[PDB]
Design a protein around this nucleic acid. Structure first.
Ligand code: ZN
Ligand code: ZN
Ligand code: ZN
Lengths: 99, 118, 111, 115, 105, 81, 237, 63, 109, 355
RNA sequence: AUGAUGUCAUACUUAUCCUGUCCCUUUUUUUUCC
């Protein structure tokens, strides 16, 4: 997995190099590739991603969408503004709290 | 050293020569190419000739049979000498029958070098 | 000049087959002595006689003819006067002459 | 013998067990006939155990036939086979009988002097 | 060997039998674990010299090929005066690596 | 507990193979008693403290030797209790 | 390499080619290796500097070691300390010329820069004492005792047994009087951790040189019931 | 408690400071020693070297 | 013709909670005679069952066949039991009394 | 399986049950990466005393008896038992028999390191739980009816004898090997004696005569088995006491030498091993007569089919016909010809010890 | 102002490893018969 220490070194690298030079950023870290550095930045570390709690507008959206386009989370996600992994876990969450 | 170890050791002899990759001409049996006599031991005391033959005839015709029984009571001592019709059948029998269970008793087979008649 | 390390007493046996070296307390070794083919002195490994809480006053080789060699230790045992809160065992603890005996057939030293 | 990181468990019991009462007067064996005692030992234990244990018998015998036996060590060694308090009672019962037999002039205990 | 705290010496009385080294172990001291200025020879307990135990590595235990010595530092502090310095226990590491291998290949 | 009695183990070993060592529970009496006994065994080894003493009193070296070895069984009083 | 034969032979040939060429260039490429990170290579370069120094006399390579101890890394400071440990054990009796050059480095390391700094300066002191035994270089060793001694209350296995080795080297080179003057006050301390340590040290002073101590013990008065004073030692004659 | 009997043995610091020949030497905890008279006498011997300051400190040494 | 780890006692998990004992019995007697059945009660053991058959072959071919059975929206996870420890003493008194019965009855000694 | 259902801890009001679950980090030891193994090992070996023996061995021992356990898992589990056995010193006093029932099979095992480790932990067990515990614990197994446990108990006995000292165990031996109801106990005691000789080796010399007198009542017994095992134990002892102790064996040269002539079969092999090992230990005016008598039997057994027979006469020939008290021409004439005719075969090469 | 607890990886220490070797595991209804 990723540790606070890698994460902060990534944040600093990206903030110096920019978001298209993943190969030198991957050279800066040990046990990390450019594929993985990129995935981490665009999944969790990007300050555009929001980690708050769901407005119930957002949750009525999530439910309506996840019924209209079933199993299509990378397509659902941008229509509501969080990553596909967050949408998906929180959706299962509402489902089991409702079950 | 009880006879079950003497079984285990003959079987070890076989599978060891297998691991070593010995040719069929320098098998340890080659030292016996002039004797069609095998010794069976560990036999149960109730088996008769009829049984020893019905069992061991699988590998050839049996020319002679010699079940050694205690002279006073006539009951079997529990071992036999057996003369096949071709030495090669003794090869087969020693490899194949050494270590089979007959009625719980696990009998044992091996060639005989310079058999002396009784 | 240590106290449990042999060197203080040194006895020999009259027929000339072994030496015993001994400390003032707790250790005794016994060396065996032989001739070789060339009749030069050759010495074995040590045997042992270690016994705890025993001063030694003197050691000497007892004379016996070609039996197992014997050594004659004076002795004592401070082990109880160490554990007698009054001073009783301080007095009325008395020496004990003891004979140790090699066993060259069996190679150990028995008291 | 070679290790330092383990303690002498005998000495530890030598401190921390509860022993018998007659276990002080040192005892010699020259002064004793045993073949008189032996049946007493046998019946004593065989009752304690409800059955017969030859090995415990011979264990006690062999531990006794020494020149001077250690009553402490003997009570310890019997603590396993018997139930611990049984060992205390049994040894503090035999050992005084030993003193009796030994100050007797034939070497025999006063119990079988009477009986 | 001053490296592995888990091992133990025979520690019983000396003898006259010189001590021997396996080829892995060749050249080092037996306590100080040095590589230099060896001064005196090793003498081993008769028990730890008896039978199959003759001519082995004091340390390794394999086939002894050369005589073991004591460094000058052991000789000066007199750590050569304690009787048989044969390690009488195998350790965790031998059987450990052995099992890791026998699982691997 | 663990460390307590395991170093109690190692020190019992040390002492029993080396009379004279100590541990955290060594009393004044046994300290000074081993210290006296060593002093005597060394007056006897050293051929010249033996002279010094035999000349300071007026005895012979054999008597002085005998007296030391007599004292060596309770050099500092009876035990603590 | 994973094999110790190869590394031993490699270190030896660093020595030989230092004998063919001068020492300087091979020694410079060897301080650079102390800049790596895996320990086995750095411990093997530390033995190679010792060998270069012992073949071509130590006065050639010391100033460069002592200077390399001023660069700000952990691993190179411990590299030069471990290298001195090896070097003093190798040169043996000729330590007596460099002991004074070295000591100001060791006290500087024994006033912490790390646990491992103190552990390795303690090993240096052990081998340096065993080497300079018998030549009257004793005030230096006593001065370093003043810095090694406070590390007696440690708990790391390696730091505590490095300090023990140092104290027994210094026992043979400074003698048991000094060592007992250091052990005395803590044998009967209130606490028990300090009694534990002090009795371990005292046992090791006692076991070796238990005879030299007869002349050294202090005078302990006699109380009511027992007589603790040794009077034979006050007979005048 | 036999512990509290040993505690009943424990002199007061002024008790100690009185009996011994040099009182400066006596510190606080010296009372708690199983041999306080010895301890103080050994602290008053010439040329000996006092225990390192940091045995009580809760932080370790050059940490 | 059996491998020894075969047992007449098997361990079953992935059961429906609260499952009807009668179902249990016939579901399992789709093979033969059931000597005994125990269902766990404490929540930790809730949902699993030890089943003691009276026939070696019954138990084994049950472990052959049913392992991989799906009832109640879950596959029945089974295994052989390793009855490798005892859990209380074997009661010498009644033991020797019933063997005393044996001997008194059949006149051995 | 208890690890699978998860519920809050304080629900498990037994703190015995809480520590039970947390001690099933045994899984993290058994399976795990080396980091997990290292950390869990340190944890268990630190928390051992608090955990207590009961919980520990109750979880650990079924593991060691599991039928599918492979090699490395067992090595790790026994290393665990080793460390906690060293931390808990006395507290194992109730579990010694369980530990033995599990560890004993390591003593007869093909992996040399398994045997050495089992020997080592049984030694530490004997030291931790003192003599009386071991004696009382393993007595009822001398008389057991499974040869398996009789054998492994014998070997374990020899280990605790090495660890604790013969002089402390010797009365118990005398007892068992002179028990008169059961010959199983006599066999097993004589066998313990054999194993002591095999293991302690040189250190039996001070007690040699005591052991030989323990054992010499067997060379005359009527039950053939215990006779054979007494002869084997004599040969073991002689080998452990090369040249020494001959005056201790003195009592026993007679039962052998007459058993030799009027014996045939397997006892012949055993008594031959014994006399062969004594022949070196003997002074020339004895060895010459004994040798020149024995070589007569030997020449006859060169044609023996038995594998133990052949191996025994190989050893014997090496000792007998290889002293300073024989003459070259006799060998050259009478031993070499049938030696090379009957021993240099392919079967011998194929065997690993006969080789 | 340095507390213990830590399923936190990092950093370090041990000229530790990475070649060392299987040989005393043979254990059961004695049984190779002129
Ligand atoms: Zn080696
Ligand atoms: Zn050394
Ligand atoms: Zn040894």
């Amino acid at each position: 997995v990723w540790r606070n220490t890698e994460d902060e070194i990534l944040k600093a690298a990206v903030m110096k190099y920019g978001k298209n030079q993943w190969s030198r950023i991957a050279s800066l870290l040990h046990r990390k590739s450019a594929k993985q550095c990129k995935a981490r930045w665009y999944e969790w570390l990007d300050p555009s991603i929001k980690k708050t709690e769901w407005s119930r507008e957002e949750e009525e959206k999530l439910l309506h969408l996840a019924k209209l386009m079933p199993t299509q989370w990378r397509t659902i996600a941008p229509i509501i503004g969080r990553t596909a992994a967050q949408c998906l876990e929180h959706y299962e969450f509402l489902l089991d709290k409702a079950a | 050293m009880n006879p079950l170890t003497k079984v285990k050791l003959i079987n070890e002899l076989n599978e060891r020569e297998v691991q070593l990759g010995v040719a069929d001409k320098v098998s340890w049996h080659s030292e016996y190419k002039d004797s069609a006599w095998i010794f069976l031991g560990g036999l149960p005391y109730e088996l008769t000739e009829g049984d020893i033959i019905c069992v061991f005839s699988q590998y050839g015709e049996i020319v002679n049979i010699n079940l050694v029984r205690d002279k006073k009571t006539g009951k079997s001592k529990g071992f036999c000498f057996l003369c096949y019709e071709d030495q090669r059948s003794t090869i087969l029998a020693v490899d194949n029958f050494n270590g089979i269970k007959i009625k719980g008793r696990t009998i044992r087979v091996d060639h005989v070098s310079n058999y002396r008649a009784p | 000049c240590r106290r449990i390390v042999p060197g203080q007493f040194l006895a020999v046996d009259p027929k000339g087959r072994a030496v015993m070296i001994s400390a003032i307390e707790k250790q005794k070794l016994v060396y065996i002595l032989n001739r070789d083919a060339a009749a030069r002195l050759t010495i074995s490994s040590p045997l042992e006689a270690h016994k705890a809480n025993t001063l030694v006053y003197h050691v000497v080789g007892v004379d016996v003819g070609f039996e197992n060699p014997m050594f004659a230790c004076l002795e004592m045992d401070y082990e109880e006067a160490d554990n007698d809160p009054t001073g009783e065992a301080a007095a009325n603890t008395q020496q004990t002459l003891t004979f140790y005996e090699l066993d060259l057939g069996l190679n150990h030293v028995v008291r | 013998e070679q290790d330092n990181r383990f303690s002498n468990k005998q000495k530890k019991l030598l401190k921390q067990l509860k022993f018998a009462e007659c276990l002080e007067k040192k005892v010699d064996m020259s002064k004793v006939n045993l073949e008189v005692i032996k049946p007493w030992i046998t019946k004593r234990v065989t009752e304690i155990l409800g059955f017969e244990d030859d090995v415990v018998i011979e264990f006690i015998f062999n531990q006794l036939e020494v020149k001077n036996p250690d009553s402490k060590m003997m009570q310890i060694n019997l603590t396993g086979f018997l139930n611990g308090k049984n060992a205390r009672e049994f040894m503090g019962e035999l050992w005084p009988l030993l003193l009796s037999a030994q100050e007797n002039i034939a070497g025999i205990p006063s119990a079988f002097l009477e009986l | 060997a001053k490296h592995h705290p888990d091992l133990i010496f025979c520690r019983k009385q000396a003898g006259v039998a010189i001590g021997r080294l396996c080829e892995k172990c060749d050249g080092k001291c037996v306590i100080c674990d040095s590589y230099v200025r060896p001064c005196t020879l090793v003498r081993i307990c008769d028990e730890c010299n008896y039978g199959s135990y003759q001519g082995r590595c004091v340390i390794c235990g394999g086939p002894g090929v050369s005589d073991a010595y004591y460094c000058k530092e052991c000789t000066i502090q007199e750590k050569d005066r304690d009787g048989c310095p044969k390690i009488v226990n195998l350790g965790s590491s031998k059987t450990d690596l052995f099992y890791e291998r026998k699982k691997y290949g | 507990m663990t460390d307590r009695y395991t170093i109690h183990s190692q020190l019992e070993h040390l002492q029993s193979k080396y009379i004279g060592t100590g541990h955290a529970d060594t009393t004044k009496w046994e300290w000074l008693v081993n210290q006296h006994r060593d002093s005597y065994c060394s007056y006897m080894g050293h051929f010249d403290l033996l002279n010094y003493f035999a000349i300071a009193e007026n005895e012979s070296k054999a008597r002085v030797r005998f007296n030391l070895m007599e004292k060596m069984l309770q050099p500092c009083g009876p035990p603590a209790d | 390499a994973h094999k110790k034969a190869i590394r031993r032979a490699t270190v030896n040939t660093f020595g030989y080619i230092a004998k063919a060429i001068g020492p300087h260039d091979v020694l410079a490429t060897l301080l650079n290796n102390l800049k790596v990170q895996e320990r086995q290579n750095r411990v093997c370069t530390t033995v190679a500097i010792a060998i270069v120094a012992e073949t071509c006399s130590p006065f050639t390579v010391l100033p460069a070691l002592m200077n390399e101890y001023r660069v700000p890394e952990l691993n190179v400071q411990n590299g030069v300390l471990k290298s001195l440990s090896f070097l003093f054990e190798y040169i043996g009796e000729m330590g007596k010329d460099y002991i004074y050059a070295v000591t100001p480095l060791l006290e500087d390391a024994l006033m912490d820069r790390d646990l491992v700094h103190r552990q390795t300066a303690s090993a240096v002191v052990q081998h340096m004492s065993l080497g300079v035994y018998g030549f009257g270089c004793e005030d230096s060793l006593n001065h370093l005792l003043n810095y090694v001694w406070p590390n007696v209350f440690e708990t790391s296995p390696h730091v505590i047994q490095a300090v023990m080795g140092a104290l027994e080297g210094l026992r043979v080179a400074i003698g048991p009087c000094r060592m007992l003057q250091y052990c005395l006050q803590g044998l009967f301390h209130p606490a028990r951790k300090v009694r534990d340590v002090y009795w371990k040290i005292y046992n090791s002073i006692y076991i070796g040189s238990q005879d030299a101590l007869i002349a050294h013990y202090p005078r302990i008065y006699n109380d009511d019931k027992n007589t603790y004073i040794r009077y034979e030692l006050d007979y005048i004659l | 408690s036999k512990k509290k009997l040993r505690r009943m043995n424990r002199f007061t610091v002024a008790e100690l400071k009185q009996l011994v020949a040099r009182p400066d030497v006596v510190e606080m905890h010296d009372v708690t020693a199983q041999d306080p008279k010895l301890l103080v006498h050994l602290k008053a011997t010439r040329n000996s070297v006092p225990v390192p300051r940091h045995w009580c400190f809760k932080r370790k040494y050059l940490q | 013709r059996l491998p020894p780890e075969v047992n007449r006692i098997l361990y079953i998990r992935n059961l429906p909670y609260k499952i009807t004992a009668e179902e249990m019995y016939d579901i399992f007697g789709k093979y033969g005679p059931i000597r005994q059945i125990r269902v766990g009660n404490t929540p930790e053991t809730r949902g699993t069952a030890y089943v003691v058959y009276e026939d070696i072959f019954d138990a084994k071919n049950a472990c052959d066949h049913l392992s991989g059975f799906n009832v109640c929206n879950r596959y029945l996870v089974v295994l052989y039991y390793n009855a490798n420890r005892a859990f209380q003493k074997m009661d010498t008194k009644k033991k020797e009394e019933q063997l005393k019965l044996l001997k008194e009855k059949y006149g051995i000694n | 399986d208890k690890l699978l259902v998860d519920v809050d801890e304080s629900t498990l009001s037994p703190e015995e049950q809480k520590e039970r679950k947390i001690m099933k980090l045994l899984l993290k030891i058994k399976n795990g990466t080396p980091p997990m193994r290292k950390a869990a090992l340190r944890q268990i070996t630190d928390k051992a005393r608090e955990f207590g023996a009961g919980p520990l061995f109750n979880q650990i021992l079924p593991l060691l008896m599991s039928p599918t356990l492979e090699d490395q898992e067992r090595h790790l589990l026994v290393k665990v038992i080793d460390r906690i056995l060293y931390k808990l010193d006395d507290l194992v006093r109730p579990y010694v028999h369980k530990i033995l029932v599990v560890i004993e099979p390591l003593l007869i095992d093909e992996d040399y390191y398994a045997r050495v480790e089992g020997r080592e932990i049984i030694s530490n067990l004997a030291k931790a739980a003192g003599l009386a515990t071991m004696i009382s614990t393993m007595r009822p197994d001398i008389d057991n009816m499974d040869e398996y446990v009789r054998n492994t108990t014998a070997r374990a006995f020899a280990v605790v004898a090495s660890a604790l000292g013969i002089p402390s165990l010797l009365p118990f031996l005398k007892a068992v090997c002179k028990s008169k109801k059961s010959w199983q106990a006599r066999h097993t005691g004589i066998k313990i004696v054999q194993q002591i000789a095999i293991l302690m080796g040189c250190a039996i010399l001070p007690h040699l005569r005591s052991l030989v007198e323990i054992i010499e009542h067997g060379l005359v017994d009527e039950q053939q088995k215990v006779r054979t095992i007494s002869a084997l134990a004599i040969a073991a002892l002689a080998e452990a006491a090369t040249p020494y102790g001959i005056e201790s064996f003195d009592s026993v040269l007679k039962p052998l030498w007459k058993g030799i002539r009027q014996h045939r079969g397997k006892g012949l092999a055993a008594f031959l091993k014994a006399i062969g090992y004594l022949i070196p230990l003997m002074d020339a005016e004895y060895a010459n007569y004994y040798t020149r008598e024995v070589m007569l039997i030997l020449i006859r057994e060169f044609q023996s089919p038995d594998e133990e027979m052949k191996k025994i006469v190989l050893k014997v020939v090496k000792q007998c016909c290889g002293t300073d008290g024989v003459e070259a021409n006799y060998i050259k004439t009478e031993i070499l010809p049938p030696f090379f005719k009957h021993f240099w075969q392919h079967r011998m090469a194929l065997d690993r010890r006969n080789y």
